[PDB]
């Protein structure tokens, strides 16, 4: 109760005293200000020039309590805007926090982990600077135990979180060797039984797979895909979300990389994902499906075998517009790479009507996408001499009325494609 709601000037008075105990008390008072529920006075603390004092306090092995209070204070300053985080880094906090990772006091070590997480979390530059200062080794050493279950819950969550921030951000992506250094521990965390650890582990993996094929490969070669697929079926949404994010990222890679996702049994989870009550899950799942239908004919076939086409018809028929649009993409990709048989199967499942209904949308891109798909479907119909059966099917659901109208469209590509369709299959 004695260090509650001090003014900044009193905090300064105590910290500038030559009395370690007075300094400890003032530092704690600063910590409590910075820990309050509402509007922590971060800038006032910075302007008082307190950061260098806090950083020096980090080095006081002789007085662990002031180490902890200043660590906590600096953590909260670093949790703010980029400028506020910069002030902490500018004060030399990075190497000081890294030295603290080795502290015999778990709560102090944990605090340093947290602070480094905030710093790395600011962006690529601070992320890489934290790495250059040598944070990874001591961080990983804290997790070098026979069984993660012996570690304190909060402690393990903080470590996992800070690691995921080290895996986060692009332009540039994290250093290749740093990723390689981290991955094995990350794979181990991905098998832990704590929901929070699992969520953050998945987020890390999703960050690492958000890039070119080579980055995806680094992850896939670690054999995590089956575990990701398992996590994809979890009951917890905060686990399913990053798990699905990662799987989606992986299938943006090569067909061989996509095949690993299929082989691991991912497609069997999609009936649920494509009807998931969470809008974002349906969108992400449909987007993922579109990149799978952009693959090989044998990969399209597995989509067929898993009974996923009716589910695509479903989302095309009714879903959030953004989702419907991913569905349109999935269809064009499907029709562009599929065999004749696969394409006819698509029409038999009822793709045509919900496709036509989306033509009335005021989004220029999806219209192009849908028009292209129709052209693809017609092409398959020509090889069957059933172009007329398609034209009527389109006519009867009011598709012709929409396409005819599209001959008068702002976009050039639109009316040209529609005009073409008219004088080729109608007229």
């Amino acid at each position: 109760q004695g260090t509650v709601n001090w003014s900044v000037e009193d905090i300064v008075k105590g910290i500038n005293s030559n009395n370690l105990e007075s300094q400890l008390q003032a530092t704690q008072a600063a910590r409590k200000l910075l820990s309050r529920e509402k509007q922590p006075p971060i800038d006032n603390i910075i302007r008082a020039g307190l950061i260098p004092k806090f950083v020096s306090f980090l080095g006081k092995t002789d007085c662990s309590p002031i180490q902890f209070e200043s660590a906590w204070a600096l953590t909260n300053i670093a949790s703010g805007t980029s400028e506020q985080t910069k002030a902490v880094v500018d004060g030399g906090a990075i190497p000081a926090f890294i030295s603290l990772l080795a502290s015999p006091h778990a709560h102090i070590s944990e605090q340093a982990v947290w602070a480094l997480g905030n710093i790395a979390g600011d962006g690529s530059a601070f992320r890489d600077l934290v790495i250059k200062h040598g944070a990874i080794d001591p961080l990983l050493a804290l997790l070098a135990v026979p069984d993660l279950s012996t570690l304190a819950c909060g402690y393990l969550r903080n470590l996992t979180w800070t690691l995921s921030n080290l895996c986060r951000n692009k332009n540039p992506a994290p250093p290749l060797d740093a990723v390689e250094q981290i991955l094995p521990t990350l794979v181990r965390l991905l098998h832990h039984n704590d929901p929070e650890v699992l969520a953050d582990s998945c987020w890390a993996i999703s960050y690492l797979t958000d890039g070119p094929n080579e980055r995806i490969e680094m992850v896939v070669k670690k054999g995590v895909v089956p575990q990701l697929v398992k996590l994809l079926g979890a009951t917890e949404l905060p686990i399913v979300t990053p798990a699905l994010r990662a799987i989606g990222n992986i299938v943006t890679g090569t067909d061989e990389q996509t095949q690993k996702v299929i082989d691991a049994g991912a497609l069997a989870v999609f009936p649920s994902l494509l009807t998931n009550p969470k809008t974002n899950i349906q969108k992400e799942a449909t987007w993922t499906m579109s990149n799978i239908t952009a693959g090989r004919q044998d990969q399209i076939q597995q989509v067929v075998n898993h009974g996923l086409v009716p589910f695509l018809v479903g989302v095309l028929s009714k879903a959030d517009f953004k989702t419907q649009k991913e569905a349109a993409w999935a269809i064009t990709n499907y029709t562009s790479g599929g065999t004749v048989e696969q394409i006819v199967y698509l029409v038999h499942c009822g793709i045509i009507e919900p496709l036509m209904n989306l033509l009335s949308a005021k989004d220029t891109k999806i219209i192009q996408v849908i028009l292209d798909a129709i052209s693809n479907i017609f092409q398959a119909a020509e090889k069957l001499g059933e172009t007329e059966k398609l034209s009527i099917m389109i006519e009867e659901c009011g598709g012709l009325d929409k396409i005819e109208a599209l001959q008068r469209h702002e976009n050039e590509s639109v009316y040209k494609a529609s005009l073409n369709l008219i004088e080729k299959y109608f007229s």
Binding site: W72, D122, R168, S206, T241, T252, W287, A294
Partner: peptide, 23 residues
């Protein structure tokens, strides 16, 4: 063909930083 993450979208919306308000 395959479509990667749009450059104008975030990486999932997870908080980048965390303020400690309790012990």
């Amino acid at each position: 063909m395959s479509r990667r993450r749009h450059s104008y979208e975030n990486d999932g919306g997870q908080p980048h930083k965390r303020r400690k308000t309790s012990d």
